[PDB]
Design a protein around this ligand. Structure first.
Ligand SMILES: [Cl-]
Ligand SMILES: [Cl-]
Length: 253
């Protein structure tokens, strides 16, 4: 059952009583391909695999996100080919390339320009802020007459160990991506690193922010439950589950 925005602080405090039992029980309850993004296969190896990406519904439209991993080098062409096919104009990346000295994602975009398969990609602008970067790319594809423009919103401030201490920076980032992504747009391609749960947190916040604005209620439990069925994009810790509540609370002031 959904929680009225007016009752959300009460709800959170009740879920925190008895040493946080309510959050623990609800998070653990989540634990015990139709929505795959289709790409036409290309002349190559008949045995070649295809990029794994899944559609996720948003509050206002179906297939609002494509959730995927940061592409391995052998999947970088299929990644940009999917961006092209889907007319994606916003990518969300929620990891540094390197965190605590460990490679979390390989750079899949040019510093200047490069060609991947039949797609030429040029970096046309970088906007660097304290907690995120906006990179603007132009794509050209052999046989096609016009550029396709893509913005990558790269959040750099997520702690390696846990959730952000305050939600304020992430909420500003989400607000920026929403304001930059037309209703005209294709799906938002979103990735982090394998098994961090950050993509799932972002998606739930994106959807619940819209639901709070439009209905004055939030239904985080059923949103996350739906997210289990759709992908390996699953909230990885009880702390993340609580943080989703703390972040929506802040956005509702
Ligand atoms: Cl294609
Ligand atoms: Cl980085």
């Amino acid at each position: 059952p959904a929680v009225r925005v007016a009752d959300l602080l009460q709800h959170i405090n009740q879920m925190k009583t008895a040493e946080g039992y309510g959050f623990k029980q609800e998070y653990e309850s989540f634990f015990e391909d139709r929505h795959r993004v289709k790409l036409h296969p290309m002349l190559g190896d008949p045995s070649a695999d295809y990029i794994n990406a899944n559609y996720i519904d948003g509050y206002h439209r179906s297939n609002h996100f494509i959730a995927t991993q940061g592409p391995k080098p052998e999947m970088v062409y299929d990644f940009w080919r999917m961006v092209w096919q889907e007319h994606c104009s916003s990518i969300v990346m929620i990891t540094k390339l390197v965190e605590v000295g460990r490679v979390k994602c390989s750079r899949y975009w040019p510093e200047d320009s490069d060609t991947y398969g039949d797609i030429k990609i040029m970096l046309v602008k970088t906007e660097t802020l304290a907690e995120y970067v906006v990179r603007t790319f132009a794509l050209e594809r052999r046989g096609y007459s016009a550029r396709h423009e893509v913005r990558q919103f790269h959040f750099t401030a997520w702690p390696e160990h846990g959730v952000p201490y305050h939600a304020t920076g992430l909420l500003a980032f989400i607000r920026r991506v929403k304001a930059s992504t037309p209703p005209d747009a294709g799906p938002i391609v979103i990735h982090c690193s394998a098994g961090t749960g950050r993509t799932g947190c972002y998606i739930v916040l994106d959807v619940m922010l819209d639901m709070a604005e439009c209905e004055g209620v939030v239904d985080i439990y059923n949103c996350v439950k739906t997210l289990c069925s759709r992908r390996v994009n699953m909230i990885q810790t009880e702390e993340q589950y609580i943080f989703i509540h703390d972040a929506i609370l802040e956005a509702c002031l």
